[PDB]
Design an enzyme around this catalytic site. Structure first.
Site, PDB file in Angstrom:
ATOM      1  N   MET A  20      11.658  -1.030   2.597  1.00 29.52           N
ATOM      2  CA  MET A  20      11.478   0.410   3.077  1.00 29.52           C
ATOM      3  C   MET A  20      10.881   0.588   4.467  1.00 29.52           C
ATOM      4  SD  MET A  20      11.481   2.428   0.433  1.00 29.52           S
ATOM      5  CE  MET A  20      11.514   2.665  -1.389  1.00 29.52           C
ATOM      6  N   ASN A  31       3.949   2.943  -4.199  1.00 30.65           N
ATOM      7  CA  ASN A  31       3.113   2.031  -4.313  1.00 30.65           C
ATOM      8  C   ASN A  31       3.416   0.810  -3.380  1.00 30.65           C
ATOM      9  OD1 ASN A  31       1.497  -0.050  -6.383  1.00 30.65           O
ATOM     10  ND2 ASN A  31       3.457  -0.845  -6.380  1.00 30.65           N
ATOM     11  N   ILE A  91       3.863  -1.685  -0.002  1.00 29.73           N
ATOM     12  CA  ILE A  91       3.220  -2.140   1.135  1.00 29.73           C
ATOM     13  C   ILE A  91       3.973  -3.078   1.905  1.00 29.73           C
ATOM     14  CG2 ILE A  91       0.942  -1.043   0.653  1.00 29.73           C
ATOM     15  CD1 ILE A  91       0.441  -4.445   0.442  1.00 29.73           C
ATOM     16  N   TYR A 130      -3.805  -2.249   7.977  1.00 33.00           N
ATOM     17  CA  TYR A 130      -3.643  -1.600   6.683  1.00 33.00           C
ATOM     18  C   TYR A 130      -4.404  -0.426   6.332  1.00 33.00           C
ATOM     19  CZ  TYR A 130      -4.202  -2.109   1.597  1.00 33.00           C
ATOM     20  OH  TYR A 130      -4.355  -1.702  -0.070  1.00 33.00           O
ATOM     21  N   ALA A 136      -5.732   1.783   8.675  1.00 30.30           N
ATOM     22  CA  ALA A 136      -5.039   2.910   9.095  1.00 30.30           C
ATOM     23  C   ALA A 136      -4.076   3.450   8.469  1.00 30.30           C
ATOM     24  CB  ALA A 136      -4.493   2.438  10.545  1.00 30.30           C
ATOM     25  N   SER A 137      -3.220   2.462   7.782  1.00 25.93           N
ATOM     26  CA  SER A 137      -2.060   3.275   7.144  1.00 25.93           C
ATOM     27  C   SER A 137      -2.591   3.764   5.889  1.00 25.93           C
ATOM     28  CB  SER A 137      -1.115   2.039   6.951  1.00 25.93           C
ATOM     29  OG  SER A 137      -1.092   1.604   5.725  1.00 25.93           O
ATOM     30  N   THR A 155      -4.045  -8.804  -8.768  1.00 24.78           N
ATOM     31  CA  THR A 155      -2.695  -9.050  -8.565  1.00 24.78           C
ATOM     32  C   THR A 155      -2.688 -10.422  -7.990  1.00 24.78           C
ATOM     33  OG1 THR A 155      -2.226  -7.968  -6.345  1.00 24.78           O
ATOM     34  CG2 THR A 155      -1.826  -6.731  -8.613  1.00 24.78           C
ATOM     35  N   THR A 193      -1.058 -11.782  -5.541  1.00 15.94           N
ATOM     36  CA  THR A 193      -1.068 -11.742  -3.802  1.00 15.94           C
ATOM     37  C   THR A 193      -2.279 -11.601  -3.470  1.00 15.94           C
ATOM     38  OG1 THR A 193       1.136 -10.455  -3.885  1.00 15.94           O
ATOM     39  CG2 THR A 193      -0.194 -10.527  -1.959  1.00 15.94           C
TER      40      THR A 193
HETATM   41  N1  LIG Z   1      -4.423  -5.705  -5.157  1.00 18.63           N
HETATM   42  C1  LIG Z   1      -5.346  -5.267  -4.433  1.00 18.63           C
HETATM   43  O1  LIG Z   1      -6.639  -5.622  -4.270  1.00 18.63           O
HETATM   44  C2  LIG Z   1      -5.072  -3.782  -3.636  1.00 18.63           C
HETATM   45  C3  LIG Z   1      -6.333  -3.100  -3.468  1.00 18.63           C
HETATM   46  C4  LIG Z   1      -6.192  -1.557  -3.061  1.00 18.63           C
HETATM   47  C5  LIG Z   1      -4.757  -1.033  -3.135  1.00 18.63           C
HETATM   48  N2  LIG Z   1      -3.799  -1.860  -3.464  1.00 18.63           N
HETATM   49  C6  LIG Z   1      -2.304  -1.214  -3.251  1.00 18.63           C
HETATM   50  O2  LIG Z   1      -1.744  -1.446  -4.463  1.00 18.63           O
HETATM   51  C7  LIG Z   1      -0.134  -1.223  -4.178  1.00 18.63           C
HETATM   52  C8  LIG Z   1       0.245  -2.516  -4.754  1.00 18.63           C
HETATM   53  O3  LIG Z   1      -0.245  -3.764  -4.251  1.00 18.63           O
HETATM   54  P1  LIG Z   1      -0.281  -5.064  -5.100  1.00 18.63           P
HETATM   55  O4  LIG Z   1      -1.547  -5.764  -4.874  1.00 18.63           O
HETATM   56  O5  LIG Z   1       0.373  -4.904  -6.669  1.00 18.63           O
HETATM   57  O6  LIG Z   1       1.200  -5.889  -4.167  1.00 18.63           O
HETATM   58  P2  LIG Z   1       2.294  -6.908  -4.747  1.00 18.63           P
HETATM   59  O7  LIG Z   1       2.120  -7.362  -6.040  1.00 18.63           O
HETATM   60  O8  LIG Z   1       2.241  -8.031  -3.570  1.00 18.63           O
HETATM   61  O9  LIG Z   1       3.594  -6.271  -4.726  1.00 18.63           O
HETATM   62  C9  LIG Z   1       4.183  -5.697  -3.336  1.00 18.63           C
HETATM   63  C10 LIG Z   1       5.457  -4.895  -3.879  1.00 18.63           C
HETATM   64  O10 LIG Z   1       5.997  -4.271  -2.802  1.00 18.63           O
HETATM   65  C11 LIG Z   1       7.510  -4.847  -2.499  1.00 18.63           C
HETATM   66  N3  LIG Z   1       7.734  -4.726  -1.006  1.00 18.63           N
HETATM   67  C12 LIG Z   1       7.088  -5.633  -0.168  1.00 18.63           C
HETATM   68  N4  LIG Z   1       7.676  -5.306   1.008  1.00 18.63           N
HETATM   69  C13 LIG Z   1       8.660  -4.414   0.913  1.00 18.63           C
HETATM   70  C14 LIG Z   1       9.407  -3.753   1.732  1.00 18.63           C
HETATM   71  N5  LIG Z   1       9.683  -3.979   2.969  1.00 18.63           N
HETATM   72  N6  LIG Z   1      10.355  -2.659   1.291  1.00 18.63           N
HETATM   73  C15 LIG Z   1      10.362  -2.356  -0.111  1.00 18.63           C
HETATM   74  N7  LIG Z   1       9.491  -3.265  -1.112  1.00 18.63           N
HETATM   75  C16 LIG Z   1       8.641  -4.120  -0.480  1.00 18.63           C
HETATM   76  C17 LIG Z   1       7.272  -6.329  -2.949  1.00 18.63           C
HETATM   77  O11 LIG Z   1       8.671  -6.778  -3.427  1.00 18.63           O
HETATM   78  P3  LIG Z   1       9.585  -7.494  -2.143  1.00 18.63           P
HETATM   79  O12 LIG Z   1       8.807  -8.417  -1.291  1.00 18.63           O
HETATM   80  O13 LIG Z   1      10.629  -8.047  -3.132  1.00 18.63           O
HETATM   81  O14 LIG Z   1      10.403  -6.777  -1.258  1.00 18.63           O
HETATM   82  C18 LIG Z   1       6.385  -6.088  -4.315  1.00 18.63           C
HETATM   83  O15 LIG Z   1       7.269  -5.454  -5.169  1.00 18.63           O
HETATM   84  C19 LIG Z   1      -0.396  -1.275  -2.774  1.00 18.63           C
HETATM   85  O16 LIG Z   1       0.121  -0.146  -2.220  1.00 18.63           O
HETATM   86  C20 LIG Z   1      -1.835  -1.667  -2.275  1.00 18.63           C
HETATM   87  O17 LIG Z   1      -2.262  -1.381  -0.988  1.00 18.63           O
HETATM   88  C21 LIG Z   1      -3.740  -3.214  -3.750  1.00 18.63           C
HETATM   89  C1  LIG Z   2      -2.490  -7.924   1.385  1.00 21.07           C
HETATM   90  C2  LIG Z   2      -3.444  -8.011   0.060  1.00 21.07           C
HETATM   91  O1  LIG Z   2      -3.104  -8.445  -1.090  1.00 21.07           O
HETATM   92  C3  LIG Z   2      -4.653  -6.959   0.028  1.00 21.07           C
HETATM   93  C4  LIG Z   2      -5.220  -6.720  -1.274  1.00 21.07           C
HETATM   94  C5  LIG Z   2      -6.137  -5.887  -1.288  1.00 21.07           C
HETATM   95  C6  LIG Z   2      -6.673  -5.062  -0.096  1.00 21.07           C
HETATM   96  C7  LIG Z   2      -7.627  -4.089  -0.206  1.00 21.07           C
HETATM   97  O2  LIG Z   2      -7.342  -2.872  -0.770  1.00 21.07           O
HETATM   98  N1  LIG Z   2      -8.818  -4.325  -0.073  1.00 21.07           N
HETATM   99  C8  LIG Z   2      -9.845  -3.211  -0.242  1.00 21.07           C
HETATM  100  C9  LIG Z   2     -10.984  -3.331  -1.393  1.00 21.07           C
HETATM  101  C10 LIG Z   2      -9.868  -2.544  -1.857  1.00 21.07           C
HETATM  102  C11 LIG Z   2      -9.443  -5.603   0.351  1.00 21.07           C
HETATM  103  C12 LIG Z   2     -10.215  -6.537  -0.299  1.00 21.07           C
HETATM  104  C13 LIG Z   2     -10.221  -7.847   0.145  1.00 21.07           C
HETATM  105  C14 LIG Z   2     -11.523  -7.882   1.520  1.00 21.07           C
HETATM  106  O3  LIG Z   2     -12.534  -6.848   1.176  1.00 21.07           O
HETATM  107  C15 LIG Z   2     -11.217  -8.555   2.494  1.00 21.07           C
HETATM  108  C16 LIG Z   2     -12.424  -8.566   3.605  1.00 21.07           C
HETATM  109  C17 LIG Z   2     -12.113  -9.634   2.781  1.00 21.07           C
HETATM  110  C18 LIG Z   2     -10.504  -6.655   2.197  1.00 21.07           C
HETATM  111  C19 LIG Z   2     -10.512  -5.428   1.443  1.00 21.07           C
HETATM  112  C20 LIG Z   2      -6.000  -5.304   1.130  1.00 21.07           C
HETATM  113  C21 LIG Z   2      -4.869  -6.188   1.228  1.00 21.07           C
HETATM  114  C22 LIG Z   2      -4.216  -9.311   1.023  1.00 21.07           C
HETATM  115  F1  LIG Z   2      -4.403  -9.266   2.108  1.00 21.07           F
HETATM  116  F2  LIG Z   2      -5.417  -9.551   0.294  1.00 21.07           F
HETATM  117  F3  LIG Z   2      -3.324 -10.278   0.462  1.00 21.07           F
END
Ligand SMILES: NC(=O)c1ccc[n+]([C@@H]2O[C@H](COP(=O)([O-])OP(=O)(O)OC[C@H]3O[C@@H](n4cnc5c(N)ncnc54)[C@H](OP(=O)(O)O)[C@@H]3O)[C@@H](O)[C@H]2O)c1
Ligand SMILES: C[C@](O)(c1ccc(C(=O)N(C2CC2)[C@H]2CC[C@](O)(C3CC3)CC2)cc1)C(F)(F)F
Ligand SMILES: NC(=O)c1ccc[n+]([C@@H]2O[C@H](COP(=O)([O-])OP(=O)(O)OC[C@H]3O[C@@H](n4cnc5c(N)ncnc54)[C@H](OP(=O)(O)O)[C@@H]3O)[C@@H](O)[C@H]2O)c1
Ligand SMILES: C[C@](O)(c1ccc(C(=O)N(C2CC2)[C@H]2CC[C@](O)(C3CC3)CC2)cc1)C(F)(F)F
Lengths: 266, 267
Positions: free
Chosen positions: B73, B99, B101, B163, B165-166, B200, B202
């Site tokens: 993307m 979804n 990032i 992140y 910011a976005s 998750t 990651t």
């Molecule tokens: N986990 C958290 O603590 C957390 C907290 C708040 C919000 N969120 C939101 O949850 C959403 C999902 O996060 P997740 O934690 O589930 O992440 P994730 O499991 O690491 O998944 C990332 C997904 O995005 C795909 N992706 C990465 N780069 C891409 C690119 N350049 N183009 C198209 N697809 C791409 C990855 O597949 P490929 O690498 O195969 O491209 C994978 O499918 C995010 O928007 C995140 O901000 C997560």
């Molecule tokens: C890319 C990644 O999965 C990610 C996962 C979750 C988030 C996210 O949305 N966070 C807010 C709470 C929801 C994070 C939780 C983690 C922390 O509080 C940092 C200060 C120690 C940051 C805020 C951002 C990125 C990463 F970086 F952890 F790998």
């Protein structure tokens, strides 16, 4: 932590500011106020003939010193080098006031991706690049970064999607590094200014077809917030916003998370 | 304004849905839930292999159908055509789930403007591009756009500036056009999901060294629930303090103290 004094023009005298978007509107007024306080101003905008007028009328109002450099913030390189130059020109820097934006008008968004991208570029990415470039000098001086935003960078309004996207972004980014500067003992304040409808030319033209507020004072408030190192400034002619706009819950959540997790993790 | 009933798995049956970043994480969970529900499903990410895992499992779970299309993307052309493909593969679109990032990690911000730019491009711009490409089908179906966000796109945090910011930007953009869809009487719902830490793969990897993560599976289910019910936001976090404090009912007040308090007939 705000300086716990009250504002006085003295605070600015001899200080080495920079205003961007200084060719007209809010930005211009700011350079003037700055002038009336005897600051070393270094203005910027695309309008080079107009910048001169402004510089010139700043020397007239009392500036320690006053220059301009003219460039487009579409251009990252200009933005970066600009800051170095305004440095040499002023012998360091105490205050980065970041005010400029790309043109926009009031319209439903339909599919102008290019307008969204450009708004992000000019209104947001350039602010960061300015920031990265200016940080070093500011450390030396324990300075301030002031960032000009809007109600529409706090709550949602139709007809300004692109522009809102970019104002929010500023909040996210700059509030975030504010946390970072703090857990890193980096003593540079960051003030986010949240403004309502202001009586600039541009604004009045676009809305002419609500109550606006005086550009002269708005600009002064911006400078006060910055001088006092406040985290935020709210300035709107209405009295609901100034009171209803502030987000105590947000503050609580930040507090909780900050005092519950060292960040000394690395 | 929302549907007025509690949720039912049925609501998704036969629905055609895109899910991005769906190879792993919350995306994957969302595919799975959608499948168990009998929705047609197009999932996308960069890696064709992991996707295939997922498509194969959505089929076993009882998707009406399931496919995938790979690209990054980072590429706006791909993003635009991606939605056309997917729409063809399903003969329409009921729900657009955004979804993905850009890979990012936890770090003090110093220098990496390129990481700031890329995060804006991928996490934000690509979503606008995806929405634009999908809006004609969505109008036609009166469907829903779901935008996945984070507490860090509603409040500040260290270590995630780019992140964050976005994510704020997503709130600004998408909440603004929602106000527009209202006055243009566009019948397409917009749901902004505010997520706390989710277990998750990651995320857990990045936080290995006291932070309480919430379960990916239920989280993914809440998102789909908020979407189908056409709510404005979904909050999901392990902490009840947080899920309460994160709401901002004032903001909804101001926005309304202007909505009716002024006229948009001209535009
Ligand atoms: N986990 C958290 O603590 C957390 C907290 C708040 C919000 N969120 C939101 O949850 C959403 C999902 O996060 P997740 O934690 O589930 O992440 P994730 O499991 O690491 O998944 C990332 C997904 O995005 C795909 N992706 C990465 N780069 C891409 C690119 N350049 N183009 C198209 N697809 C791409 C990855 O597949 P490929 O690498 O195969 O491209 C994978 O499918 C995010 O928007 C995140 O901000 C997560
Ligand atoms: C890319 C990644 O999965 C990610 C996962 C979750 C988030 C996210 O949305 N966070 C807010 C709470 C929801 C994070 C939780 C983690 C922390 O509080 C940092 C200060 C120690 C940051 C805020 C951002 C990125 C990463 F970086 F952890 F790998
Ligand atoms: N006025 C309001 O009702 C309102 C409300 C809330 C917040 N604000 C904020 O106040 C700040 C200033 O607004 P304003 O009303 O003073 O605006 P303005 O009168 O339209 O001035 C914009 C300034 O930025 C410059 N600029 C425009 N494009 C540029 C570019 N590509 N590169 C470098 N400079 C550029 C313009 O000069 P050149 O064309 O000469 O380059 C001008 O100096 C903005 O951040 C705005 O969002 C305004
Ligand atoms: C570039 C320009 O001057 C501008 C001026 C002001 C603002 C701004 O920050 N606004 C929020 C109040 C603070 C506006 C106020 C004007 C309105 O409410 C429109 C919806 C009827 C939109 C929101 C944005 C852009 C423009 F667009 F008018 F040209």
């Amino acid at each position: 932590q705000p300086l716990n004094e009250e504002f006085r023009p003295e605070m600015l005298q001899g200080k080495k500011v920079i205003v961007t978007g200084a060719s007209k509107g809010i930005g211009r007024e700011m350079a003037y106020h700055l002038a009336k306080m005897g600051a070393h101003v270094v203005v910027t905008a695309r309008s080079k003939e107009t910048l001169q007028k402004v510089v010139s009328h700043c020397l007239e109002l009392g500036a320690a010193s006053a220059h301009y450099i003219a460039g487009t913030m579409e251009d990252m390189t200009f933005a970066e080098q600009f800051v170095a130059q305004a440095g040499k020109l002023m012998g360091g820097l105490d205050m980065l006031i970041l005010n400029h934006i790309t043109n926009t008008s009031l319209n439903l968004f339909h599919d102008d991706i290019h307008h969204v991208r450009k708004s992000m570029e000019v209104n947001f990415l350039s602010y960061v690049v300015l920031t990265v470039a200016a940080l070093p000098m500011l450390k030396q001086s324990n300075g301030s970064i002031v960032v000009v935003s809007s109600l529409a960078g706090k709550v949602a309004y139709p007809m300004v999607a692109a522009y809102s996207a970019s104002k929010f972004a500023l909040d996210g980014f700059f509030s975030s590094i504010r946390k970072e500067y703090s857990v890193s003992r980096v003593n540079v304040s960051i003030t986010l200014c949240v403004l309502g409808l202001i009586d600039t030319e541009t604004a009045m033209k676009a809305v002419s077809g609500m109550q606006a507020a005086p550009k002269e004072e708005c600009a002064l408030e911006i400078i006060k917030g910055g001088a006092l190192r406040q985290e935020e400034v709210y300035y709107d002619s209405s009295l609901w916003t100034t009171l209803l706009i502030r987000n105590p819950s947000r503050k609580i959540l930040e507090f909780l998370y900050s005092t519950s997790y060292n960040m000394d993790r690395f």
